[PDB]
Amino acid sequence: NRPNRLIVDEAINEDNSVVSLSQPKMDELQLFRGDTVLLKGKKRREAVCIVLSDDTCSDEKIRMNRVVRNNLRVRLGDVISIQPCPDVKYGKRIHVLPIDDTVEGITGNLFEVYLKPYFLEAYRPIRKGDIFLVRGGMRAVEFKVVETDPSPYCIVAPDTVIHCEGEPIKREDEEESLNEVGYDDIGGCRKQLAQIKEMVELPLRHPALFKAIGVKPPRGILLYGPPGTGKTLIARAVANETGAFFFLINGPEIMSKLAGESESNLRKAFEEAEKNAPAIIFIDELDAIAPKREKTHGEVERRIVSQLLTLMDGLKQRAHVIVMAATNRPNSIDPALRRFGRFDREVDIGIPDATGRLEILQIHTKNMKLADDVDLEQVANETHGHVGADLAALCSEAALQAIRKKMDLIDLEDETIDAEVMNSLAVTMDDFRWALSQSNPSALRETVVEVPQVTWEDIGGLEDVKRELQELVQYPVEHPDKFLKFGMTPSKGVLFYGPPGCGKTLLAKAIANECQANFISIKGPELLTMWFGESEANVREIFDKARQAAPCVLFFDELDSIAKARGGGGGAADRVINQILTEMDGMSTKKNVFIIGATNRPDIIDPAILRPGRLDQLIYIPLPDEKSRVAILKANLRKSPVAKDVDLEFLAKMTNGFSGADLTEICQRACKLAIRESIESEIRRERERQTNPSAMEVEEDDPVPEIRRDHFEEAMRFARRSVSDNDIRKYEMFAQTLQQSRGFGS
Amino acid sequence: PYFLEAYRPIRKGDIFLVRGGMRAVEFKVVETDPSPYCIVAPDTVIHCEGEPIKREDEEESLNEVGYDDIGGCRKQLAQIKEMVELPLRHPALFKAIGVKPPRGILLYGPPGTGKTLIARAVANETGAFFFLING
Numbered sequence A: 001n002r003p004n005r006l007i008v009d010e011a012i013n014e015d016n017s018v019v020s021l022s023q024p025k026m027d028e029l030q031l032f033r034g035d036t037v038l039l040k041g042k043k044r045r046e047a048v049c050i051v052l053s054d055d056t057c058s059d060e061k062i063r064m065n066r067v068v069r070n071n072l073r074v075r076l077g078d079v080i081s082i083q084p085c086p087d088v089k090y091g092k093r094i095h096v097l098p099i100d101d102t103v104e105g106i107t108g109n110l111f112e113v114y115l116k117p118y119f120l121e122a123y124r125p126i127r128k129g130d131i132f133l134v135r136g137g138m139r140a141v142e143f144k145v146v147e148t149d150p151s152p153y154c155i156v157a158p159d160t161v162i163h164c165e166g167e168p169i170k171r172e173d174e175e176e177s178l179n180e181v182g183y184d185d186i187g188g189c190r191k192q193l194a195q196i197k198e199m200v201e202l203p204l205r206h207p208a209l210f211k212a213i214g215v216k217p218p219r220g221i222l223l224y225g226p227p228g229t230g231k232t233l234i235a236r237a238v239a240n241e242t243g244a245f246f247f248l249i250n251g252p253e254i255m256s257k258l259a260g261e262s263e264s265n266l267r268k269a270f271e272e273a274e275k276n277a278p279a280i281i282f283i284d285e286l287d288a289i290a291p292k293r294e295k296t297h298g299e300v301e302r303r304i305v306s307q308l309l310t311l312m313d314g315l316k317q318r319a320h321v322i323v324m325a326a327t328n329r330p331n332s333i334d335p336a337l338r339r340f341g342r343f344d345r346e347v348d349i350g351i352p353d354a355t356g357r358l359e360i361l362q363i364h365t366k367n368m369k370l371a372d373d374v375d376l377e378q379v380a381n382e383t384h385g386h387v388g389a390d391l392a393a394l395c396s397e398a399a400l401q402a403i404r405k406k407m408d409l410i411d412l413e414d415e416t417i418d419a420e421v422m423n424s425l426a427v428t429m430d431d432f433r434w435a436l437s438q439s440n441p442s443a444l445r446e447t448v449v450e451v452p453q454v455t456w457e458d459i460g461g462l463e464d465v466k467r468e469l470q471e472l473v474q475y476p477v478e479h480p481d482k483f484l485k486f487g488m489t490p491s492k493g494v495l496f497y498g499p500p501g502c503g504k505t506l507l508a509k510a511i512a513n514e515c516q517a518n519f520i521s522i523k524g525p526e527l528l529t530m531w532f533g534e535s536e537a538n539v540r541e542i543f544d545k546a547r548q549a550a551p552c553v554l555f556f557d558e559l560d561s562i563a564k565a566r567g568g569g570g571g572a573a574d575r576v577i578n579q580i581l582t583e584m585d586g587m588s589t590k591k592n593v594f595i596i597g598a599t600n601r602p603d604i605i606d607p608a609i610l611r612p613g614r615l616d617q618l619i620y621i622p623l624p625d626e627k628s629r630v631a632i633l634k635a636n637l638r639k640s641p642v643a644k645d646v647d648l649e650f651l652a653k654m655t656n657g658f659s660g661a662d663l664t665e666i667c668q669r670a671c672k673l674a675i676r677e678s679i680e681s682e683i684r685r686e687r688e689r690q691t692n693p694s695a696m697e698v699e700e701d702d703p704v705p706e707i708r709r710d711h712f713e714e715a716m717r718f719a720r721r722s723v724s725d726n727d728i729r730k731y732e733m734f735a736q737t738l739q740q741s742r743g744f745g746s
Numbered sequence B: 001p002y003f004l005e006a007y008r009p010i011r012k013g014d015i016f017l018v019r020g021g022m023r024a025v026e027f028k029v030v031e032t033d034p035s036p037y038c039i040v041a042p043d044t045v046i047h048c049e050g051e052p053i054k055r056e057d058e059e060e061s062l063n064e065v066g067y068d069d070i071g072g073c074r075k076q077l078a079q080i081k082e083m084v085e086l087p088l089r090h091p092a093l094f095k096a097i098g099v100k101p102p103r104g105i106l107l108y109g110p111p112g113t114g115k116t117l118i119a120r121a122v123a124n125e126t127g128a129f130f131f132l133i134n135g
């Protein structure tokens, strides 16, 4: 019962000689955050590192980098003893040698480019026989600390002369390489990688214990997503990091053979993974082998599908084999493969969000050298609809434009192998600014599931509606116990209705931002574009995406288009509304999926939507008042530089009966007047400066930097109301008599 | 915990079964000194040391499937017993009657509701020969 045996978890820090610990474990273990610890591992191999602190780190777990993890012959979830050692002295001679595979391109220097900035103000604790890694110069490079004269371990001081001359040596056959793929090469998919580790790590770490329990493990894991999102990468990383045997079956490579060779290749893969248990068999591109029953023709294709089903069912009589697979959508797989005892667990890898895209861009720009203006958060906010492969291509294209301009400088003697041109080489912001425009993203039709970025501050007015939406959406998530006590059940749906342009889409986004839930937006034209024989699996697919990503807000915008397409034979409108109604009835509230609709025409809505148990909360969103108009105009003008002279309350008194869209239109029109005036002034000053050279005052400056009362008072003369007064009386009537539409009605 | 406040009447040569610990376990009462049958009192010292022995080839195992592994389908299992139990219990008598039995029984339902299980249980519990063809 010792407090020094610890177990490895994933690393957050980026350094090669830093381990992390939580503070109570250090205080029990008598360690401070400047110490120099010694770490023992399997096959009697040990390491030396600098410890620091963390709060996200637990006590039963230590977080260390992959380079330390591979110098200890340790994988994820293994045992390591830590002990303090202030017995570390400085050095005199330290002999390093590169490793033969990483040094086949460059020749010339290795000391000043690589080793010189690495040990400067670092004092990295090294030991004899350790491999370390340096990034820089569009390449990563390995070295091994071969010999220390104060043997065996020391701290690299400026006293130590570092021998970097000799032959790059060969590897030992059990040295784990650093060009392999691990968990740090994957970004933007934290949750899914956690699920796959939970499913897979225990039945492959502990086969004997888990056989001795008597529980069944999973055996079929189907990864799916759009093309190019890193599924082959995830399977390869789980295989390398658990250390299991790994056999790869490729889809076209099996279907390209002749007949009896295809059957025997499948059978040999499953037998060979019997022999070397534990294993992982990865079937890449499954829908080339086993597509739909109606899309196969012949004897050979159906015979291969039946072969694969026999082997998947016969895995039960085997020991410790996981079968993974990958496909671009689940609906094209033969549905007999997704039963029980076959591919029964599904993991969905989607397109990344903004945090994900920044993390991809940081992965691919490791070995490159960036210029000092390049801010990758702006690139990550610009690139929308990019999967990971597109971001890798964008980084590669920017690097090639930089090397092309340096061949515009240096072309004559650049043909030799120089390290200096690589030293000077840098990628500016305009290269990324170029390659952003000449890039063709590939996931724009895909439905986006993310948290929105519209807070409550973008919305002006509407103060009781916000309270009512909190009490509908947020309260049965945070406080389920009150609803258990008082004996009621929460409701499921809301319908917003009202005049055009008053802020319904913004409210539906802001409550999803408030509750930190996902958000799926569907518009009426998107449902009507879905075809005659195609709308069915599509509406079911949207309600499935809502169940997988719960707690969710599923928002049906623009219902008046679906209503107007009925009656001019409008059969597709009736088919879509009936199928939405059936899916709402089937939905059980124990996943916290919450449904919202919105309409500008509350007179032609289908009354069966308003039934209790369906969208039966009716919130009327009206034209704003004078205080509300002041709040709207303040909300739209937060980014614009506005002069002090502007009176907003005067604009609110002058604009009566406007909606929110018209107030935004007035702001847009005034800003265009400002840009026109500025460009006239720049043409006039350029003309005058060029027509009178040698001017005594070279004073470049903003002539008008802000928006004054002239611009708003001119933009006010072109204002037009969007909602006429007869319409206002009709919306006031429906505000009270909408709920009576279900009987005979009107 | 098994024999505590139980006083279970045992006999020499019987197999019994204990559940617990994410596993079921078998034992056989091999030898009683008041031969052959007795009641397990706190007087009895219970020898639980030795080698776990092999089975006899006609010992019916308890990892097989019977009618107690099926739940939630009382009515249908009653129908299948009525159709099947008499023509397989008494073949000679039923041939001597002159009535035809059924010969094709189609079980159907959604995926995952235990159809393979029901057929396997009827096969084990009647003791008929059983051949499995897989599609």
Ligand SMILES: Nc1ncnc2c1ncn2[C@@H]1O[C@H](COP(=O)(O)OP(=O)(O)OP(O)(O)=S)[C@@H](O)[C@H]1O
Pocket (backbone or CB within 6 Å): A185, A186, A187, A188, A189, A226, A227, A228, A229, A230, A231, A232, A233, A234, A328, A360, A363, A387, A388, A389, A392
């Ligand atoms: N999440 C990611 N993080 C880092 N790199 C990624 C990521 N996703 C994709 N990539 C890069 O994109 C390349 C192609 O990804 P793939 O693994 O081929 O994706 P995929 O699932 O194979 O798509 P298909 O349908 O097989 S073409 C990878 O080799 C990586 O370089």
Ligand SMILES: Nc1ncnc2c1ncn2[C@@H]1O[C@H](COP(=O)(O)OP(=O)(O)OP(O)(O)=S)[C@@H](O)[C@H]1O
Pocket (backbone or CB within 6 Å): A458, A459, A460, A461, A500, A501, A502, A503, A504, A505, A506, A507, A632, A635, A636, A660, A661, A664
């Ligand atoms: N209450 C409001 N506060 C701030 N901006 C608003 C408000 N209402 C409307 N806007 C602005 O007007 C635009 C239209 O708002 P939406 O919420 O999309 O209105 P809508 O109810 O969906 O009606 P339409 O048909 O879509 S214009 C928004 O993008 C805002 O720029």
Ligand SMILES: Nc1ncnc2c1ncn2[C@@H]1O[C@H](COP(=O)(O)OP(=O)(O)OP(O)(O)=S)[C@@H](O)[C@H]1O
Pocket (backbone or CB within 6 Å): A339, A340, B069, B070, B071, B072, B073, B110, B111, B112, B113, B114, B115, B116, B117, B118
């Ligand atoms: N009524 C039940 N009582 C107890 N366990 C059941 C029951 N139904 C299913 N199971 C369990 O579910 C497992 C799978 O059932 P199966 O016998 O495979 O059903 P099934 O009819 O084979 O479905 P398919 O279409 O063949 S995949 C069984 O091995 C049992 O563990």
Ligand SMILES: [Mg+2]
Pocket (backbone or CB within 6 Å): A231, A232, A284, A285, A326
């Ligand atoms: Mg692939």
Ligand SMILES: [Mg+2]
Pocket (backbone or CB within 6 Å): A504, A505
């Ligand atoms: Mg809108």
Ligand SMILES: [Mg+2]
Pocket (backbone or CB within 6 Å): B115, B116
């Ligand atoms: Mg079956």
